[PDB]
Design a protein around this ligand. Sequence first.
Ligand SMILES: Cc1cc2nc3c(=O)[nH]c(=O)nc-3n(C[C@H](O)[C@H](O)[C@H](O)COP(=O)(O)OP(=O)(O)OC[C@H]3O[C@@H](n4cnc5c(N)ncnc54)[C@H](O)[C@@H]3O)c2cc1C
Ligand SMILES: NC(=O)c1ccc[n+]([C@@H]2O[C@H](COP(=O)([O-])OP(=O)(O)OC[C@H]3O[C@@H](n4cnc5c(N)ncnc54)[C@H](OP(=O)(O)O)[C@@H]3O)[C@@H](O)[C@H]2O)c1
Length: 540
Amino acid sequence: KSPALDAVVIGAGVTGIYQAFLINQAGMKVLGIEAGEDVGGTWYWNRYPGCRLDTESYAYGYFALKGIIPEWEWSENFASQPEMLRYVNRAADAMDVRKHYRFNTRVTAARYVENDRLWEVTLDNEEVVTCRFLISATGPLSASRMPDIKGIDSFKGESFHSSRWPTDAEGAPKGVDFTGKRVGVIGTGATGVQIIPIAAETAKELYVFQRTPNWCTPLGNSPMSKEKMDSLRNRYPTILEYVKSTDTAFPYHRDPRKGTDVSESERDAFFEELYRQPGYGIWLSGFRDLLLNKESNKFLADFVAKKIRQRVKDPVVAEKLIPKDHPFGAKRVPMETNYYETYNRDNVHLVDIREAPIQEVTPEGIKTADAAYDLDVIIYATGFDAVTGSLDRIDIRGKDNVRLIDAWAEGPSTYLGLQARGFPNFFTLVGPHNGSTFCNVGVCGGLQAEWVLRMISYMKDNGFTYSEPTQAAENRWTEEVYADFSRTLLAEANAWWVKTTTKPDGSVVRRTLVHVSGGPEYRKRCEQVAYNNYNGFELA
Ligand SMILES: Cc1cc2nc3c(=O)[nH]c(=O)nc-3n(C[C@H](O)[C@H](O)[C@H](O)COP(=O)(O)OP(=O)(O)OC[C@H]3O[C@@H](n4cnc5c(N)ncnc54)[C@H](O)[C@@H]3O)c2cc1C
Ligand SMILES: NC(=O)c1ccc[n+]([C@@H]2O[C@H](COP(=O)([O-])OP(=O)(O)OC[C@H]3O[C@@H](n4cnc5c(N)ncnc54)[C@H](OP(=O)(O)O)[C@@H]3O)[C@@H](O)[C@H]2O)c1
């Protein structure tokens, strides 16, 4: 029993469609499967007000950089979701990729057949296809999660998670006009932070329910003249080479200097300039020791904090938005268009819901431990189940009928962030130990799929039909990803990222759900392994 397809690719976001294009371009049989109507993933699903890149548009647009759609015109330095969706669409045209996809179809299970070295893939609990290789491009941040919060279904008004905003026939979102409504927004991650200022322009009243402020910096978006766009296009080969060489694939790189290498007065001048220029420079061009040295982090934390107080006129309000939990740049930093100034409006109220938690949602509004709020509308900007989440929702079974869920219970275990022992011929793209959290995913995802294609090509060419990490390679990779991660300041910030298992005999295993070496050093490890005939995989 031999498989119908060389590969199934799950997902039609930017990673999936590109992976599918490469496999077919290499002369192989691929089937792509997508739950939504059409291409885009993130940019198909997220139609909330303010949705917009945090990556420079020309940097994220790997399909333009690579010469698949070089003629592409960006209208803004940080494109909005609608523009991003037209981008993914136009690229799906050039790649002629849609004819390889089933849409409106959800993978519900995937079972590795040991005797036949193949994957049985189940579609909406009915049809079953077979493939040599299973490749998930299921997304690091798809799979919305609701707040665990009592009474959700009683609200008598309109109610959404931010990733499921209803639209008109044209694709444009509806119920965007809040004129004369009282609006609740729960959550202040990068999603809430984009919505709240747009909500505030039309809402009669606006309540923001914040469990934990983030460090947010100004985005500094503006339009992109045709002249500048032509200029960028002309230097695409330089820009590409440059983003392939930085640690995050953003067009920034760390200052060579330590924080304490300049006076206090020089830091401030330096911080002041980056703060004012657009994009992630303030975070990504910082001092080399920004995420490794408590004191060097406090310099910048102190500085952004001072900026929050300058921008928010009310001092009690302003201190509630300054975080005390965590170091700056310890999470993907949300960037904003007039976020703080919004709280100077008369119709906008910040509700600290850590000191006074929500009890329940009510037919009339929301109820906290010390107040009630009549609300006409509620927006759940409460985030996603990250990296591993979209995989958990598929019943994935490997050798010996073992659940991926159970294999990764003590935390994700991979080789190269790409395969897992127990799960042969299975590739996880922009999953764990891969670096997604701080990546320009447009670029990182792209390069990861090219590497997977090269390994698939190698096997076809050698007539191999079996690949799986050795236990030793996977142990060494996984331990090493953790060691590097323990050396930065992210370790005591987000301890939920670390899973710690004191087994029953006394042994202690530590895994992080997050890779933090640079992309270049990652890709270098992958090429050393690829060239040395995939040293670390059993290949047969
Ligand atoms: C609002 C938002 C803004 C972002 N902005 C940036 C940014 O500016 N820069 C950056 O680098 N990153 C950004 N990201 C991260 C983002 O995840 C990546 O840029 C990128 O879009 C991920 O692409 P992907 O193809 O890997 O996954 P996705 O875009 O998440 O697509 C995965 C697809 O798989 C589908 N799927 C999942 N399970 C199944 C199944 N069981 N069966 C069938 N289909 C399934 C989903 O429907 C989805 O379409 C942003 C993310 C969000 C949510
Ligand atoms: N390019 C962009 O501008 C952009 C835009 C959107 C998203 N993204 C990406 O998507 C990721 C997720 O961002 P997100 O804003 O969608 O989600 P998120 O960052 O995880 O934030 C969810 C928010 O809801 C709050 N929340 C979670 N559970 C809650 C509960 N049970 N009750 C009340 N409040 C709760 C969280 O608070 P706690 O911290 O207390 O849990 C948090 O502030 C980001 O890291 C970013 O990488 C990027």
